[PDB]
Design a protein around this ligand. Structure first.
Ligand SMILES: Nc1nc2c(ncn2[C@@H]2O[C@H](COP(=O)(O)OP(=O)(O)NP(=O)(O)O)[C@@H](O)[C@H]2O)c(=O)[nH]1
Ligand SMILES: [Mg+2]
Ligand SMILES: [Mg+2]
Ligand SMILES: [Zn+2]
Lengths: 104, 38, 134, 419, 176, 122
RNA sequence: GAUGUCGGCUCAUCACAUCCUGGGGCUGAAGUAGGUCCCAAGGGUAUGGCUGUUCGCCAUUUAAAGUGGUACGCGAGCUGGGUUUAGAACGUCGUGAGACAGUUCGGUCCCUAUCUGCCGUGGGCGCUGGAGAACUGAGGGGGGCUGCUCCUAGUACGAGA
RNA sequence: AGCCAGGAUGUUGGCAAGCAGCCAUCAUUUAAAGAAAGCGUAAUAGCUCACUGGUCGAGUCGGCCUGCGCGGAAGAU
């Protein structure tokens, strides 16, 4: 088993529905301009602030991601190849760092 | 055991012992008589 | 080990007697032959419980015991029951002659320095049943 | 415990009639002093007052003349009818169900009884939320304006429902407690018999006589609240649990019956019901009907039952006996409480009632049977005891099959007489 | 207090060294060491030991008594070993010694194995018995307690590991 | 891929013609029942004088779906309709005797052997 | 010289008097299954019918469907079913105008974000001659749920079940 | 406080044996024993407490009045 680290595909500025799996509000039944909006973002004046680390819209992807415990299917010395089960982070032609599995 | 603010000897085999800043009753006959203050 | 009262003279009555002491493992056909011959001289109907020191291989041997005292009181009283609480209702007070006749049952196997001290012992049950002396 | 005018109506057309003597008994048990007892006759209830306008004016005049404090109807009447009677006569009005709830409130001494009675009162009062007289008046407003957001009637309904749910939750806690107390016996092969019936049936004193344990009994209606369980001896199965129970009355309130779900768990799960009946009561058939009706209401009519006619001493020149069905199973028994007649026959019928064994074994061994004494006398008993020749001892025994099996497993079972 | 006053008659053939607070005792069975509390003065004045408090310590007497008991156990252990008995009550419960390792069968789906400490030895005269021998009373007690921890005696049938001296209270099961 | 409110045909002779899934059994918030998954159903159409009747609530097993099953080599078997086989609530054995139409090897488990035995194909 | 009300949606956050999962004492704990108390807040913690509903009843689930705080969290985030306008009608009251903590049908929800906060992303300078890389890691965030089946084993326990 | 020894006679008191409950609740030989403290026994047997002495050589027992401490003591950025 190996762990593969790479830079995931970059999605750019991502809304809360895509970035955090927020549930969209009603598409009909009176909804005014509030279909994919994040909804409420806090309480009323007792905290009086937005808390740090809150799930909102922003940059998604294009970040270091590791995938752990992927099976090694084939190790080919002559052609300098390693076949690993499953998808690994990043686009085709991007740098990957492959380590032995730490958990195994 | 039973945790109650009032701990007493429930029979003649009970013994009061203070262990970790906590008063306890240990009984060598009836395990129901195990008590701690709390 | 269990013990129960035994009828001395009766053989094969259904309610009271069977596991009295023969079920402990004593050969009753010999025990209630020798002891029945002994109690033939004893008055009619005195259940007398002896101490048991026996084996479990068809062999036995019994020690002597004096007959009871509580059973004998109710002869002259004319009543064969008991009161719920003595000292309030009585079954008829009996005489000192009868009390000493009952006492003489326990006189042959007592090691006391003075035999008169047994008077209090015998009259304890007299007071605990309602046979107050005059 | 105040002055009252009593009201009764002869609704002979339908089965919604009630007994005036029983009503007076309930009133006196409550402790109320009756200054007058008014009677009427109608076909169906008047919607406005529950009585005619003329009869309502008569009860108002009676209250005015006698200076009475309350008016006790012998009937269920609606909140609007109560309101209209209150408007005619300033004195307060108590329904039959209100009187019963008040009696139970006075009688309740235990935590469980208090909980059940307050639940019943809370439901009965939640029915009577019709007048919202308050000093805050109607809260005017509009769109986007401050305010409570809801009506006071709805708010009060919310509050009553919430507190009713709270009483209920503590009641299922009490049910869990009583269920643990029950489950102590069910893991054992316990026989459990619950004696139940109409009030003043003598069933509490029957319990007292059978169990030799003191429990309250008198000529007071609804004397007993909550059950009492006691160990009793029966020839066949040995140890059994006799349970006393709170009595019934014609037309128990449904809210009260629902409240007593925790208390009635003994009758729900009883292995036998002893339906104790006052033979001297001229309304004996009505008592049977009412008791069966409440049993159906609590859904406990499928349990085995056995009727027990008490108070035969009030019947002239009668001796106790047992009436038996076509299947030769005792379905009815007669007896008396004080004289003790019929008690041994009740015990014999109880022996016959529950059992699954009639075979009797005969045992004998060499001198290795003190353990047999202990085990037999441990499970049940020695049925027929005697000795025979050569020191052998011939027992005859009859104990349940479960006792047979456990004895066989425990012992070497070399006696080859007991299975 | 009184135990502290009572002195420890140190027998022959055992070597005592009072290295300040550190106290070492050698004997036929082995060497045992202790580091007494700071509020104890341990002294030689004969073929014996003497215990007392150091001035300026409230505990003083308390410590003194504890040191006396510990050193008495030390000398007893080095002279003659401390022994402990354990017994296995069970349908198929068993013990075996493979050399500083005690294999136990106690109804578990796996076999238990207890590796003994350094100075403790084990024997099994019978499959249902374990004999512990050692120098330190505390260590042999702790090892016996660990052996009991796997299956301490349950009340209904007395099933498991019990000290041979213990009275195990047995309660009847639910009625009928 | 079977949800609540979805209509299923019946692939057995228990009597029901169409049933509706009202709970997907398994875990909490579970979404879909695939082939070989137990569902809770209500009968919406039934032949008269059958074992079951209209309005009955009982259990069923999905034996065919339009979404299909995936095989380990990556193939898909899709069907023209969704069909199930009725089961008893407390025993999970099929109510009927005959099974109509094909099934898959996803029912190759110790509990659905009786369905596989009387299925006409696979 | 205005601090928008009930319920719903979106998004949540803490407390622990714990609903589930973990650890344990007692048990009227034989076993399975429970009860009660103590420790424990890491994670998890229903879908529908009816009703404006919160609740509640019911159906079917789940390991569980916790209890409370947060302007009874959350309308410069949505809605507008309910309450609390103007139209109209029924019952009731009043001579009437009208009224009702009765019911019924209908009935406008604005704001382009300066500051705090928060999610992302840059410019400047600094880090002591400049520049290119590769790091250590002080510190911070994420994540931490659980069911069912089989073996041990029809064994331990149990009269059996 | 530690360390050895005895708890028996009527009698299984009576209405189940001291030990379900109820009434007598008194003797006894005697250094001593409550018609019996719970356990336990179907219940006896058994268990042993109260009950009394031996050996053990400096303090020990438990009520009162008070100083200061301990537990009783769980909330929401
Ligand atoms: N003449 C006579 N009176 C009896 C008889 N049995 C009971 N009684 C009397 O009737 C009343 C019975 O009351 P009780 O024992 O409480 O019976 P209950 O039905 O359990 N009371 P409740 O159900 O109301 O709690 C008492 O007055 C008792 O004296 C009987 O056989 N004959
Ligand atoms: Mg839109
Ligand atoms: Mg009663
Ligand atoms: Zn105790």
């Amino acid at each position: 088993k190996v762990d593969v680290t790479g830079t995931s595909k970059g999605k750019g500025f991502a809304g809360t529905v895509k970035r955090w799996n927020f549930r969209t509000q009603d598409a009909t039944h009176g909804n005014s301009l509030s279909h994919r909006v994040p909804g409420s973002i806090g309480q009323n004046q007792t905290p009086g602030k937005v808390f740090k680390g809150k799930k909102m819209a922003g940059q998604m992807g294009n970040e270091r991601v590791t995938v752990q415990s992927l099976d090694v299917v084939r190790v080919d010395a002559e052609r300098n190849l390693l076949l690993v089960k499953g998808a690994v982070p990043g686009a085709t032609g991007s740098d990957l760092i492959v380590k032995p599995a730490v958990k195994a | 055991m039973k945790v109650r603010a009032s701990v007493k000897k429930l029979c003649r085999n009970c013994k009061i012992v203070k262990r970790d800043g906590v008063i306890r009753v240990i009984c060598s006959a009836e395990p129901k008589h195990k008590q701690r203050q709390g | 080990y269990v013990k129960l009262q035994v009828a001395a003279g009766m053989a094969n009555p259904s309610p009271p007697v069977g596991p009295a002491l023969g079920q402990q493992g004593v050969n009753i056909m010999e025990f209630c032959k020798a002891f029945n011959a002994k109690t033939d001289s004893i008055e009619k109907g005195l259940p007398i419980p002896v101490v048991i020191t026996v084996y479990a291989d068809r062999s036995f041997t019994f020690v002597t015991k004096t007959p009871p005292a509580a059973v004998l009181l109710k002869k002259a009283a004319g009543i064969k029951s008991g009161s719920g609480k003595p000292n309030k209702d009585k079954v008829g007070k009996i005489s000192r002659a009868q009390l000493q006749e009952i006492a003489q049952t326990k006189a042959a196997d007592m090691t006391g320095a003075d035999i008169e001290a047994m008077t209090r012992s015998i009259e304890g049950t007299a007071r605990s049943m309602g046979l107050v002396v005059e | 415990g105040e002055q009252a005018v009593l009201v009764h109506i002869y609704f002979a057309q339908d089965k919604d009639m009630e007994d005036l003597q029983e009503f007076e008994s309930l009133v006196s048990s409550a402790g109320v002093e009756a200054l007058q007892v008014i009677t009427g006759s109608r076909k169906a209830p008047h919607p406005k007052y529950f009585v005619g306008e003329g009869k309502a004016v008569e009860i108002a005049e009676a209250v005015k003349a006698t200076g009475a404090s309350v008016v006790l109807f012998d009937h269920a009447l609606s909140p609007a009818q109560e309101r209209n009677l209150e408007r005619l006569c300033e004195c307060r009005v108590i329904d039959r169900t209100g009187l019963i709830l008040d009696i139970f409130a006075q009688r309740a001494r235990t935590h469980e009884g208090k909980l059940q009675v307050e639940l019943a009162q809370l439901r009965h009062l939640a029915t009577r939320l019709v007048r919202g007289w308050t000093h805050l008046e109607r809260q005017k407003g509009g769109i986007g304006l401050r305010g409570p957001g809801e009506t006071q009637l709805e708010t009060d309904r919310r509050l009553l429902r919430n507190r009713i749910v709270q009483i209920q939750s503590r009641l299922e806690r009490v049910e869990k407690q009583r269920e643990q107390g029950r489950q102590s016996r069910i893991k054992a092969d316990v026989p459990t018999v619950s004696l139940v019936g109409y009030t003043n049936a003598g069933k509490s004193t029957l319990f007292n006589r059978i169990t030799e344990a003191r429990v309250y009994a008198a000529d007071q209606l609804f004397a007993t609240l909550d059950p009492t369980l006691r160990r009793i001896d029966v020839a066949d199965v040995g140890e059994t649990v006799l349970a006393d129970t709170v009595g019934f009355i014609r037309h128990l309130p449904h809210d009260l019956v629902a409240a007593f779900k925790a208390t009635l768990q003994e009758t729900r799960q009883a292995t036998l019901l002893l339906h104790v009946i006052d033979a001297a009561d001229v309304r004996v058939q009505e008592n049977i009907e009412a008791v069966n009706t409440v049993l159906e209401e609590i859904d406990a009519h499928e349990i085995p039952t056995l009727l027990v006619m008490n108070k035969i001493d009030m019947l002239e020149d009668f001796e106790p006996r047992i009436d038996r069905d076509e299947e030769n199973k005792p379905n009815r028994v007669w007896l008396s409480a004080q004289t003790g007649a019929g008690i041994p026959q009740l015990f014999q019928a109880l022996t016959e009632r529950l059992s699954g064994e009639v075979a009797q074994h005969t045992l004998r061994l060499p001198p290795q049977e003190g353990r047999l004494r202990s085990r037999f006398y441990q499970l049940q008993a020695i049925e027929k005891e005697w000795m025979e020749e050569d020191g052998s001892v011939s027992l005859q025994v009859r104990m349940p099959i479960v006792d047979w099996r456990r004895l066989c497993k425990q012992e070497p079972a070399l006696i080859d007489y007991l299975i | 207090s009184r135990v502290a006053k009572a002195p420890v008659v140190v027998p022959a053939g055992v070597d005592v060294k009072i290295n300040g607070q550190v106290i070492t005792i050698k004997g036929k069975n082995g060497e045992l060491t202790r580091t007494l509390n700071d509020a104890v003065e341990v002294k030689h004045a004969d073929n014996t030991l003497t215990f007392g408090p150091r001035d300026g310590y409230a505990d003083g007497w308390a410590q003194a008594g504890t040191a006396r008991a510990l050193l008495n156990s030390m000398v007893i252990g080095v002279t003659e070993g401390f022994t402990k008995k354990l017994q296995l009550v069970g349908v198929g419960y068993r013990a075996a010694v493979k050399g500083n390792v005690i294999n136990l069968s106690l109804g578990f789906s796996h076999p238990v194995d207890h590796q003994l400490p350094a100075g403790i030895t084990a024997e099994c005269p019978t499959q249902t018995e374990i004999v512990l021998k050692g120098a330190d009373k505390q260590v042999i007690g702790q090892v016996a307690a660990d052996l009991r921890a796997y299956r301490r005696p349950e009340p209904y049938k007395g099933k498991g590991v019990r000290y041979a001296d213990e009275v195990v209270r047995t309660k009847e099961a639910k009625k009928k | 891929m079977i949800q609540e409110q979805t209509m299923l045909n019946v692939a057995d002779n228990s009597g029901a013609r169409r049933v509706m899934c009202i709970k997907v059994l398994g875990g909490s918030h579970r979404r879909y029942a695939g082939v070989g998954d137990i569902i809770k159903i209500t009968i919406k159409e039934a032949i008269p004088r059958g074992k079951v009747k209209k309005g009955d609530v009982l259990k069923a097993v999905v034996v065919r779906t339009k979404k299909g099953v995936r095989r380990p080599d990556g193939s898909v078997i899709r069907f023209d309709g969704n069909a199930c086989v009725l089961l008893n609530n407390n025993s999970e054995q099929p109510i009927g005797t005959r099974i109509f139409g094909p099934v898959t090897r996803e029912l190759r488990s110790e509990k659905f052997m009786k369905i596989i035995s009387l299925a006409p194909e696979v």
